[PDB]
């Protein structure tokens, strides 16, 4: 009995609370959306509109979370720029070996990162170990695989370049969500050990049954999505 | 001087289980990958087993997998290998080494005889 | 699993003289970051394992210049210059590029008399 551009001004503080806490950007870009819910004709555009706004505003948290760098997805490097700036002498040999699989060089992660415009961090293993560790004490279903040329030891005596691919999501089917990932990514993870390139690929999810400790965000964000874009959803259905 | 000193070897029952220890000496150990080596009587050097400065890597020989675990305690300087389901075929003389910079054996050990016998 | 393969399995020589050996991998040791991943070692009778050769050619620090090694790819040597009597024993060569890391059977060094 609701409409729509009236949602939205009952949960104009929730929203007001999400807007705020979300990196300047990815707030900008939930504020344009939350504008296009309101003034939405159709339940199908709003629903459209809100389910941008649920991953938009996750993956903020996420960077907020991990102290990494949200970027909009126009921004987003691609796996071709990245092998390109990253390790440009071997990008010649990265595009032969795309030639039957050219869809590769556009695979465009939400994390794209290397060891100290693909983002910098401090140490790969380190972003491992922690997903790892909260998988193990947690069970939160992590998909995960690293480049490896033939049986090759890492070493002591020098340092490479790496990358390290992260994908996230905020959808009701987690395990569908690594699984998809990680297939996606296996034809590139391999491709890399046969360029003696060193990548980790790391894959993710919650959803809102997610007990509010236990997501991949600060349970303060949790709370900040519960209280707007999910309560957004149902609003939206119940009327 | 780097110095490496096993302890912990002897005699043992088949499917019996024994902990070599392994005390560094003369170098940061806490930076350093660290290894263990054996040699059977009369017959010649087999790698065992791997682990990094962190522990975040470890690697094992095929034919130890499932029965030793390598681990170490940097504050303490100390290395260890434990040892599970031996069989005679595990009878040894049992080495640490390290590469003090790389994965190649630079520094050893006198190493510690362990034998796996009724 | 890397096979390194060794010849001679022994070898005779007069003091003085120079000692070749060689050490056949079965794979490749250049790893993806350039260097290559094979030594040489010493057992002397009743001893510890000394390094003498790590990747290919850095002789040890501490070890006597009669010792050099060369090579590339699957095919290295270990040479001796000029052969003293403690250099009695059983060399080895290994590699650390791939997992496991794997050594050679071994040559026996022999004073010829």
């Known amino acids: 009995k609701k409409p729509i551009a009236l949602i939205c001004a009952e949960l104009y503080k929730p929203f007001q609370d999400l807007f705020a806490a979300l990196p300047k950007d990815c707030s900008e870009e939930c504020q344009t959306l939350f504008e296009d819910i309101r003034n939405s004709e159709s339940h199908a555009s709003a629903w459209s509109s809100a389910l941008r706004i649920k991953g938009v505003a996750y993956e903020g948290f996420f960077s907020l979370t991990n102290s990494w760098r949200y970027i909009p997805a126009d921004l987003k490097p691609t796996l071709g720029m990245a092998i390109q700036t990253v390790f440009p002498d071997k990008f010649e040999k990265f595009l032969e070996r795309t030639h039957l699989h050219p869809e590769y060089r556009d695979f465009t992660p939400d994390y794209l990162m290397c060891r100290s415009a693909v983002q910098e961090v401090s140490s790969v293993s380190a972003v491992v170990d922690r997903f790892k560790s909260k998988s193990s004490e947690k069970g939160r279903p992590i998909r995960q695989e690293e480049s490896r040329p033939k049986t090759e030891s890492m070493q002591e005596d020098i340092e490479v370049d790496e990358l390290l691919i992260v994908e996230v999501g905020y959808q009701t089917d987690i395990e569908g969500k690594v699984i998809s990932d990680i297939e996606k990514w296996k034809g590139v993870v391999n491709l890399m050990s046969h360029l003696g390139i060193k990548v980790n690929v790391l894959t993710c999810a919650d959803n809102s049954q997610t007990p509010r400790t236990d997501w991949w965000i600060d349970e303060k964000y949790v709370r900040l999505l519960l209280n707007s874009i999910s309560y957004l959803f149902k609003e939206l259905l119940e009327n | 001087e780097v110095k490496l000193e096993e302890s912990g070897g002897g005699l043992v029952r088949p499917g019996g289980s024994r902990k070599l220890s392994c005390a560094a000496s003369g170098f940061t150990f806490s930076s350093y990958g660290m290894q263990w080596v054996r040699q059977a009587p009369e017959k010649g050097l087999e790698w065992v087993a791997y682990?990094?400065?962190?522990?975040?890597?470890?690697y094992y020989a095929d034919t130890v997998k499932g029965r030793f675990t390598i681990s170490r305690d940097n504050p303490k300087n100390t290395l260890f290998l434990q040892m599970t389901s031996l069989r005679s075929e595990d009878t040894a003389m049992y080495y640490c080494?390290?590469?003090?910079?790389?994965?190649?054996?630079?520094?050893w050990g006198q190493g510690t005889l362990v034998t796996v016998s009724a | 699993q890397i096979v390194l393969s060794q010849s001679p399995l022994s070898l005779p020589v007069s003091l003085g003289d120079q000692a070749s050996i060689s050490c056949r991998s079965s794979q490749s040791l250049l790893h993806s970051n350039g260097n290559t991943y094979l030594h040489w070692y010493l057992q002397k009778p009743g001893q510890s394992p000394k390094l003498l050769i790590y990747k290919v050619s850095n002789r040890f620090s501490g070890v006597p210049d009669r010792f050099s090694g060369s090579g590339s790819g699957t095919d290295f040597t270990l040479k001796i210059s000029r052969v003293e009597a403690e250099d009695l024993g059983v060399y080895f060569c290994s590699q650390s590029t791939h997992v496991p890391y794997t050594f050679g059977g071994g040559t026996k060094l022999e004073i010829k008399r």
């Open positions: 682990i990094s400065s962190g522990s975040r890597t470890i």
């Open positions: 080494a390290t590469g003090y910079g790389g994965t190649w054996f630079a520094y």
